[PDB]
A paper describes a structure:
The sulfur atom of phosphorothioated DNA (PT-DNA) is coordinated by a surface cavity in the conserved sulfur-binding domain (SBD) of type IV restriction enzymes. The sulfur modification-dependent REases SprMcrA and ScoMcrA use an SBD to recognize the DNA backbone phosphorothioate link of the RP stereoisomer, which is adopted by the naturally occurring PT modifications in five DNA core sequence contexts in prokaryotes. By contrast, the SBD of the PT-dependent restriction endonuclease (REase) SprMcrA from Streptomyces pristinaespiralis has a relatively relaxed sequence specificity, targeting GPSGCC, GPSAAC and GPSATC, but not GPSTTC or CPSCA. The sulfur atom of the PT linkage was inserted into a cavity which formed by Y31, Q32, Y78, P79 and A82 through Van der Waals interactions; the phosphate groups flanking the PT linkage formed electrostatic bonds with R29, R73 and R85, as well as hydrogen bonds with Y31 and A101.
Crystals for SBDSpr in complex with the RP form of the 8-bp hemi-PT DNA oligonucleotide 5′-GATGPSATCC-3′ were grown at 14°C with the reservoir solution containing 0.1 M Tris–HCl pH 8.5 and 4.5% PEG 8000. The SBDSpr–GPSATC complex crystals belonged to the C2221 space group, with two molecules of SBDSpr and two molecules of GPSATC–DNA in the asymmetric unit; the structure of this complex was determined to 3.3 Å by the molecular replacement method with the Phaser program, using the structure of SBDSpr–GPSAAC as the searching model. SBDSpr showed the highest binding affinity for GPSGCC, with a dissociation constant value (KD) of 5.55 nM, followed by a KD of 38.33 nM for GPSATC and 94.67 nM for GPSAAC. In all structures, the ND1 atom of H102 formed H-bond with O6 atom of G4, and the OD2 atom of D104 bonded to the N4 atom of C7. It's worth noting that the ND1 atom of H102 also formed H-bond with N7 atom of G4 in GPSGCC and GPSAAC sequences, while this H-bond was not existing in SBDSpr-GPSATC complex. SA5 showed a significant deflection in GPSATC sequence, compared with GPSGCC and GPSAAC sequences, leading to formation of another H-bond between the ND1 atom of H102 with the N6 atom of SA5. In conclusion, HGD motif formed five H-bonds in SBDSpr–GPSGCC complex while four H-bonds in SBDSpr–GPSATC and SBDSpr–GPSAAC complexes, which explained why SBDSpr showed a highest affinity for GPSGCC. In the case of GPSATC, the percent solvent accessibility of T6 methyl group was calculated to be only 10–15, corresponding to fully buried with the SBD-DNA interface. The multiple C–H…O contacts between the methyl and Y78 were believed to be attractive for GPSATC. Difference in the weak non-bonded interaction between GPSATC and GPSAAC results in a lower KD values for GPSATC than GPSAAC bound by SBDSpr.
Numbering used by the authors: 4 to 162
Amino acid sequence: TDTDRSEDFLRRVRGLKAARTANGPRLYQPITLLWAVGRARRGEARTLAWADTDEAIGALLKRHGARGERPRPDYPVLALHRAGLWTLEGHVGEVPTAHGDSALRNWFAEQRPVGGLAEPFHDLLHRSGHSRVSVIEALLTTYFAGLDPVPLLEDTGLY
DNA sequence: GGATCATC
DNA sequence: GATGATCC
């Protein structure tokens, strides 16, 4: 029930498709997850209007874009939607992929979908502390291997 | 709107 | 071959 929902979450995170720079993975997705991991910790709303998130995640990409991350939260949240971790509804029709640039801006600017982390994962990280460490340590090892994470970890309530 | 690369 | 993204 709860433990199965836990290892479900990790399985999806371990099997994430992320782009990789010359020296490591692009941090678009972990910046997104840790932003939602922190919000789930403080019990904050689950879903948010895209402009409110586009700013929030985009702000963190501006501050901690260690691999030239530009403030484009639409790339990770589409990969995470395909990964089963993100809920997108409000839009009409079908959700695009994260291959391109213009269409990613146009789709989000036109539909303006309300998005958040998946309902069972958000509530799980709220109540379960065992899962917050297993999701942070997993993301920190695979994505931030060699980098200073504590500035980002601070700016999301995850110190 | 596109060429292009790396990863899946 | 489809998907996460750089770059024009």
